[PDB]
């Protein structure tokens, strides 16, 4: 029974508790991030469980400081817990060093915190994967962070139920556009990829959420995609589905 406590290595050097934490993530809704020429785009799938859910109201994408967006799949509370920490961690940085936290700096902050929850048997690993990033002093950055505390930089990233479709669509974009991708293209494409990945869960209806942080389209601040831009991206995903 090598899988009763967290800080336990299996005889093969694995951590079964973390591996089980991943199952909670795979079980989750699908989310993605796309790194464009001068920014980042985050998109997520909101399962409409019932007509009674208020539209546009159960926001999932979270801002950290002013320049970072975070999206996650898995246990929603666990992700909130992680963003709260990300916010404390970003404030503490800004307080001492005056500049807003660089994305790699912020990445490792989340990273170290997550890894800590795999060192002790009085704690469980987090049951989320988080996709996050923004613009700093030297470019756009996109990151993905797994329950083990593993994280790397990405050109594109996906997690949750629709992960495999999304990654396949993501891989294509990387091949068809080596030059870069405009922030408005990346938004349109993000709506597409979420729509395609939905089929793995097609029995319920869903609402789409997008947000972005672009140097030229938002001044390097994180903003939600709303109204006209959201509708035009939806119409694109609808039209490109047929």
Partner 1 sequence: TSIMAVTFKDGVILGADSRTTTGAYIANRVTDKLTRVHDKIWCCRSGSAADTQAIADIVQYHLELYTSQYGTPSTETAASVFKELCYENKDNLTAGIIVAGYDDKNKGEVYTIPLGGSVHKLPYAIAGSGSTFIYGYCDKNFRENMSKEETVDFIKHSLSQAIKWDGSSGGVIRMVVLTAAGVERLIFYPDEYEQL
Partner 2 sequence: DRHITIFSPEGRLYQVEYAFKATNQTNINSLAVRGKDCTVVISQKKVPDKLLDPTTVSYIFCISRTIGMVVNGPIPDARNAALRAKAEAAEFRYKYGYDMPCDVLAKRMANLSQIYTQRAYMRPLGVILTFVSVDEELGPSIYKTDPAGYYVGYKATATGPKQQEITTNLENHFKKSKIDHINEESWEKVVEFAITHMIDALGTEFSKNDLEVGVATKDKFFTLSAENIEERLVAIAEQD
Q: How far is CA 160 from the centre of its chain?
A: 10
x/- map, 65-104, partner 1, by CB under 8 A: ------------------------------xxxxx--x-x
The answer to whether 4 contacts partner 1 (rule: CB under 8 A) is: no
Q: How far is the CB of 9 from partner 2 (least distance, A)?
A: 4
Rounded to whole angstroms, how far apart are CA atoms 143 and 108?
Answer: 10
* Residue 69 binds which of Mg ion, partner 2, partner 1, none (CB < 5-8 A, kind-dependent): none
Residue 83 or 142: the one with the smaller Cβ distance to Mg ion is 142
Minimum CB distance to partner 2, residue 170 (Å): 6
Whole-angstrom distance, CA of residue 167 vs CA of residue 107 = 21
Dihedral (CA of 89, 65, 93, 106) sign? positive
Sole binder of partner 2 in the list 29, 73, 118, 159 (CB under 8 A):
118
Q: Between 160 and 179, how does the x/- string for binding to partner 2 read (CB under 8 A)?
A: -------x--xx--x-----
Distance CA 196, CA 178 (A): 23
Picking from 39, 40, 81, 43, the residue whose alpha carbon sits closest to that of residue 60 is 43
The site partner of 95 among partner 1, Mg ion, partner 2, none (C-beta below 5 to 8 Å per kind) is partner 1
Minimum separation from the CB atom of position 95 to partner 1 (A): 8
Helix (H, G, I), strand (E, B) or coil at 161: coil
Residues 79/100, Cβ–Cβ less than 8 Å: no
- Residue 177 binds which of partner 2, partner 1, Mg ion, none (CB < 5-8 A, kind-dependent): none
- Considering just the CA atoms, what is the radius of gyration of the chain in Å? 18
Compare residues 38 and 78 and give the one whose CB is closer to partner 1: 38
Q: Residues with catalytic annotation?
A: 29
Cα–Cα distances in Å, from 203 out to 94, 193, 198? 45, 18, 9
User: What distance in Å separates the CA atoms of residue 77 and residue 84, rounded to the nearest whole number?
Assistant: 11
Instruction: Please say whether the beta carbons of 197 and 28 come within 8 A.
Output: no
Name the site residues for partner 2 (rule: CB under 8 A).
2, 4-5, 7-14, 35, 104, 108, 111-112, 114-116, 118-122, 142, 148-157, 167, 170-171, 174
Name the site residues for partner 1 (rule: CB under 8 A).
95-99, 102, 104-105, 108
């Amino acid at each position: 029974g090598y899988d009763l406590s967290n800080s336990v290595f299996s005889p093969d050097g694995r951590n079964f508790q973390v591996e089980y934490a991943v199952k909670a993530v795979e079980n989750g809704t699908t989310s993605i991030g796309i790194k464009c020429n001068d920014g980042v785009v985050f998109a997520v799938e909101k399962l409409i469980t019932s007509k009674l859910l208020v539209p546009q109201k159960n926001v999932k994408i979270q801002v950290v400081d002013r320049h970072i967006g975070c999206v996650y799949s898995g246990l929603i509370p666990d992700g909130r817990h992680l963003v709260n920490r990300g916010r404390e961690e970003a404030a503490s940085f800004k307080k001492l060093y005056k500049t807003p936290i660089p994305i790699p700096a912020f990445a490792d902050r989340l990273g170290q915190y997550v890894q800590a929850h795999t060192l002790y048997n009085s704690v469980r690993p987090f049951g989320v994967s988080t996709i996050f990033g923004g613009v700093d002093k030297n470019g756009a950055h996109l990151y993905m962070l797994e329950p083990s505390g593993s994280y790397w930089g990405y050109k594109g990233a996906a997690t949750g139920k629709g992960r495999q479709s999304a990654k396949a669509e993501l891989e294509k974009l990387v091949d068809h556009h080596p030059e870069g991708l405009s922030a408005r293209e990346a938004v349109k494409q993000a709506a597409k990829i979420i729509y395609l990945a939905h089929e793995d869960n097609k029995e319920k209806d869903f609402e789409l959420e997008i947000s972005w942080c672009s140097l030229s389209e938002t001044n390097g601040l994180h903003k939600f995609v709303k109204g006209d831009l959201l509708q035009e991206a939806i119409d694109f995903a609808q039209k490109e589905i047929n």
